[PDB]
């Protein structure tokens, strides 16, 4: 048939619940394509994955592949305007994003289903002929430099690059993947390298259609999607570039049996055990790596962790295989260290090898593999509908490793149990291959070496072959036993018929003094899953810094005890998260509705009857101590968001105030607090999914009767159900709170333009304005001025009040970031008065499409309802009401809103700024307006007292 089509694969195996339709094909120029047709999709999406990563960088220009990723967005010869691509998506309810791994460079986007072609056409040009404009090159190089800059003090990246640095220096694995201003601009200017043609040469040499894979998802039929792809991608040239494989391992003999001691930025204690293994990619169907991991990294009774934790050496454990590249992989066992654990590191590793030998003594087990295979089958069958944008990216990446007919099922289903392969991998997990790394600040001043790229303080030793054979002669431990049978494996996948009196939105089926139960039977997804959400309210949770700490430790200790039990449930697709809020506790249970009532009770009555292990108590507490202290090493832009929330909230305890009162937290004071907390509660719940009305009423009534029995819980007064308000800023005012991040060498800033209380009128005023300034904010502040890699714009919502906020991380002082934003805001208003009515209407429809997008997953829908519940506005039909109002707005409705609320000389301008200074800081463009003199907040407590407190938003429904 088609000359542009090499072949068309057979039926793409999918889940029977999947109502999308799939067609796989391969183009003449070698591009593997998967077409997904979903006539319901509001946001059409597409993605392309090139099988070339940062392992293929030129030895001199580190991270050239990463740099090229950034540059493809900034223009092609067909669409020459620098921000043509980004502007188009933003004007049609779409977004875009990309990344560069060791072997892949993945690009993706979504867009309104009516404009799939218009975006795909511009997206296709990325590989045909990119401009690689030099003025854009010398600007965007700072974005890469700033992107790497925010990671220099990140303990994760410092360790990730260190592992690469302690291997064979000439193996591509030791390369610097990110790149910076030094490798891209500074050095190539010294040595005299034309960076632009180095880019152009890399594109024609590696971005061949041979190594590409395209996934397109649209409302269009499978046949029309075929025509669309062969029109825009069949022209992409083919260089027949061989797929880069790296057979020889980066970790050879001289790198083995080596001990590393590393100084971190945070106060953390970690033990990193690693083994070199062959590329187990081709054995993916038996999957021996996942098998060995599942048993090692197990957290149930008799596991490696359950012993290493019950004697207080480690709290968390992670095992399994780690992808390196085509030709080599790793097998790792990473653990958290306690204060006592750090001293007994070599005995931890002993217990590791004692467990490895236990698997060797009993050999492979088919029943273990079978229930893994079984659970994966159920997991795949009832797989939640993925969001179009993330779906096409995920598939396009694995569209290389697998046949067309297997791509959806390849990494889920397992077919033939192969114990012989399980033996092989386990055979490589022996002491003569171990690579140990200890991360603690007890090594400061005890190091020789420094990692070049990050400045990581460490040193390389040789594991005494003294110690090696003690590990080799590991005696079989008696406390190590293989997992028992999983009782939490779901059997009843029955979908209960939609009740006669069912409702489109959650309904209040129970309303007492103690409970307020919201219920809605699932009508859109029809999977055997339920979402159980509970909020327990009690004024004694956050009345002072002391009770706040104890509420945290209480829930942290409760989760710690349930961990062994609840682990088998999580594997069986049934999970829960329990955490403390500023109003009490939050309990969420998600997964298969079969054995939910089982887990829910084992949570509640365990919660009402807690029996604190004080051994654990001071370990968790000690971890909490370092947790609060480690906030000093967080990102500057995070410190900004943290301070603003502290400023604008009626009551909020600081990190310092908490760790100050943490020393006052003793065990008897804590167990005098738990019944005090559970003495009087108010429970507001949302039960959503595969449950009937009396099923939900039975679930709630069961929760109460457990608390009423084991805690003697009684109802709270309606008077005591008070929620915190937001500080009301004065007209024409400006406040500035300034601090300094001691760790990061970058600055941070958040600029909150408080507008008014939340309402249909005010919300769509703000949301539309944020929609219009959405792309230009990124284009002006980052693409052009290059203030920083992190530039964010959008609405802020807290305690029923809203406003417009800017967030920028930079190396410029925050006061300069201040001016450039204000200069940009005058640039925007002038851009509004001058844009066409059809341009303005083009923005309205975009915002409408973005907010009418239906949830794909069950929990996705539950989130919105719960969002209307905890905010206590209960506007369940919010999206329809406010979009209808949105389309009635005109240009001067927005202009008048700007001149009144946001303008530099607006009568009702409410502005507050947070200035986080860098570690070392003191004190062509449009011209910034003259700013009023800012009132500097010196004390937060006195700040709040001077200003009024906003009202609380009235509930949409009267009770």
């Amino acid at each position, epitope marked *: 048939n088609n000359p542009a089509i090499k072949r068309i694969g057979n039926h793409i195996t999918k889940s029977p619940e999947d109502k999308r339709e799939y067609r796989g094909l391969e183009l003449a120029n070698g591009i593997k394509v998967l077409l997904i047709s979903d006539p319901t999709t509001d946001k059409s999406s597409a993605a392309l994955d090139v099988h070339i990563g940062s392992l293929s960088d030129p030895p001199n220009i580190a991270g050239l592949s990463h740099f090229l990723q950034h540059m493809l967005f900034l223009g092609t010869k067909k669409y020459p305007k620098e921000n043509e691509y980004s502007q188009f998506l933003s004007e049609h309810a779409g977004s875009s994003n990309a990344f560069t791994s060791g072997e892949h460079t993945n690009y993706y986007f979504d867009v309104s289903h009516e404009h799939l072609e218009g975006a795909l056409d511009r997206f296709a040009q990325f590989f045909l002929s990119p401009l690689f404009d030099e003025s854009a090159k010398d600007r965007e190089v700072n974005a890469v430099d700033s992107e790497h800059e925010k990671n220099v003090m990140n303990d994760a990246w410092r360790l990730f690059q260190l592992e690469k640095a302690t291997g064979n220096p000439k193996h591509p694995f030791s390369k610097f993947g990110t790149g910076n201003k030094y490798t891209l601009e500074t050095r190539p200017n010294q040595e005299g390298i034309d960076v632009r043609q180095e880019l152009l040469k890399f594109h024609s040499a590696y971005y061949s259609s041979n190594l590409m894979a395209v996934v397109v998802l649209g409302r269009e039929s499978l046949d029309d999607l075929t025509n669309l792809v062969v029109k825009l991608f069949s022209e992409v040239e083919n260089k027949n570039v061989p797929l880069p494989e790296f057979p020889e391992h980066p970790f050879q003999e001289e790198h083995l049996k080596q001990l590393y001691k590393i100084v971190p930025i945070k106060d953390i204690r970690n033990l990193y055990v690693t083994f070199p293994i062959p590329d187990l990619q*081709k054995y993916y169907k038996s999957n021996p790596g996942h098998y060995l991991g599942h048993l090692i990294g197990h957290e149930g009774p008799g596991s490696l962790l359950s012993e290493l934790k019950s004697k207080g050496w480690v709290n968390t454990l992670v095992g399994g295989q780690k992808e390196g590249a085509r030709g080599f992989m790793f097998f790792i066992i990473n653990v958290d260290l306690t204060e006592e654990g750090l001293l007994h590191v070599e005995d931890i590793i002993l217990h590791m090898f004692q467990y490895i030998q236990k698997l060797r003594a009993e*050999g492979p087990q088919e029943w273990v593999f079978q229930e893994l295979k079984d659970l994966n089958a159920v997991a795949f069958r009832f797989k939640d509908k993925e969001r179009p944008r993330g779906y096409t990216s995920k598939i396009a990446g694995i569209l290389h490793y697998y046949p067309l007919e297997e791509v959806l099922t390849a990494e889920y289903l397992l077919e033939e149990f192969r*114990p*012989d*392969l399980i*033996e*092989m991998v386990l055979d490589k997990l022996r002491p003569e291959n171990v690579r140990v790394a200890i991360v603690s600040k007890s090594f400061e001043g005890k190091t020789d070496r420094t990692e070049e790229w990050y400045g990581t303080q460490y040193k390389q030793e040789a594991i005494p072959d003294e110690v090696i054979k003690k590990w080799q002669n590991a005696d079989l431990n008696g406390k190590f036993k293989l997992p028992t049978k999983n009782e939490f494996i779901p059997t009843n996948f029955e979908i209960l018929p939609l009740e006669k009196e069912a409702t489109p939105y959650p309904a209040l089926i129970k309303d007492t003094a103690m409970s307020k139960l919201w219920f809605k039977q699932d009508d859109k997804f029809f999977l055997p899953k339920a979402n159980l959400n509970f909020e327990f309210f009690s004024p004694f949770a956050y009345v002072d810094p002391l009770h706040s700490n104890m509420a945290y430790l209480y829930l942290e200790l409760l989760k710690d005890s349930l961990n062994e039990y609840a682990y088998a449930a999580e594997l069986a697709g049934l999970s829960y998260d329990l955490q403390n809020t500023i109003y009490g506790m939050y309990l969420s249970v998600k997964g298969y509705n079969d054995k939910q009532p089982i887990l829910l009770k084992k949570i509640i009555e365990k919660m009402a009857t807690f029996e604190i292990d004080e051994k654990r108590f001071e370990i968790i507490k000690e971890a909490y101590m370092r947790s609060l202290n480690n906030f000093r090493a967080e990102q500057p832009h995070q410190h900004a968001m943290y301070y603003l929330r502290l400023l604008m909230t009626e009551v909020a305890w600081t990190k310092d105030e908490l760790k100050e009162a943490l020393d006052d937290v003793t065990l008897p004071r804590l167990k005098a607090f738990i019944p005090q907390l559970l003495s009087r509660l108010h429970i507001e719940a949302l039960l959503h999914g595969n449950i009937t009305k009396q099923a939900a009423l039975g679930i709630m009534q069961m929760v109460e009767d457990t608390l009423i029995e084991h805690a003697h819980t009684k109802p709270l007064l309606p008077s005591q159900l008070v929620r915190y308000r937001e500080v009301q800023l004065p007209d024409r005012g400006w406040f500035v709170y300034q601090q300094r991040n001691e760790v990061h060498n970058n600055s941070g800033i958040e600029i909150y333009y408080q507008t008014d209380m939340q309402s249909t009128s005010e919300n769509m005023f703000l949301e539309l304005f944020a929609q219009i300034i959405s792309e230009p904010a990124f284009n002006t502040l980052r693409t052009k001025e290059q203030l920083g890699y992190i530039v964010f714009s959008g609405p802020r919502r807290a305690n029923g009040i809203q406003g417009l906020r800017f967030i920028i991380q930079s190396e410029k002082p925050p006061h300069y970031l201040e001016s450039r934003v204000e200069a940009f805001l005058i640039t925007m208003e002038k851009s509004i008065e001058d844009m066409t009515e059809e341009a303005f209407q083009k923005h309205i429809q975009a915002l409408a499409i973005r907010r009418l997008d239906k949830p794909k997953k069950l929990s996705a829908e539950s989130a919105k309802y719960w969002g209307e519940i905890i905010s206590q506005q209960y506007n369940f039909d919010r999206d329809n009401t406010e979009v209808a109002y949105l389309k009635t707005l005109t240009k001067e409705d927005i202009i008048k809103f700007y001149k009144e609320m946001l303008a530099v000389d607006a009568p009702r301008r409410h502005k507050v700024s947070v200035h986080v200074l860098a570690r070392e800081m003191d004190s062509n463009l449009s011209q910034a307006p003259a700013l009023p003199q800012p009132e500097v907040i010196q004390n937060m407590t006195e700040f709040k007292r001077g200003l009024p407190l906003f009202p609380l938003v009235k509930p949409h429904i009267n009770f």
Partner: antibody
Amino acid sequence: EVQLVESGGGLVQPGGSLRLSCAASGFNVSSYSIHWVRQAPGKGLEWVASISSYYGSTSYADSVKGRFTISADTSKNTAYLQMNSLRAEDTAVYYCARDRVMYYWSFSKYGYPYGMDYWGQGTLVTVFN
Amino acid sequence: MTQSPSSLSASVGDRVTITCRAVSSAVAWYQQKPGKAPKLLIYSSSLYSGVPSRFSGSRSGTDFTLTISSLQPEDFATYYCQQSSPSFLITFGQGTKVEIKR
């Protein structure tokens, strides 16, 4: 489709040498292990040799260790059976067969009898005085 | 290793049970018509593709059994049991010839 073809079957005599070849078609010897199973006239099956081209380890039967030698040529997809010193016991029909599964770990401490899905039609060796 | 009975005779439609005996803990089964190459029947309980469901793979302790539920006229052949062991070894049985009873 998958098929195995034996060749080199002929009439030969003690002191003399003979080399049977197993042409593999439809798959690579690189992945699967290749076996040589012979059947004496009238009697049952006797496993003679086996080679794993991937992990590079061979295995012979006690009945014949010094006289036979197995080998695998990767790119021509052929496994051989060098028979250089022959008795009258060797007069039999020699089949070549592969593993049904890929990359069978030869150094396995346990034994896993996955089937041998594809056999050749075998060549006849005959040892005469 | 040792496989009994050596020969077996039953009419078509009958239930035939052949027993192999034992170290590894599994066995395979092959069917060979006189003169031509052996065909695979059962590997590991589980049977090979194309092989009729009348063939069964069972294991009771130390003995493995091949079972033909309803014997067919095309099922009259010699059946060998094959054991894979450590050191990359392969051992067959002497075989059981199933003949026609009349």
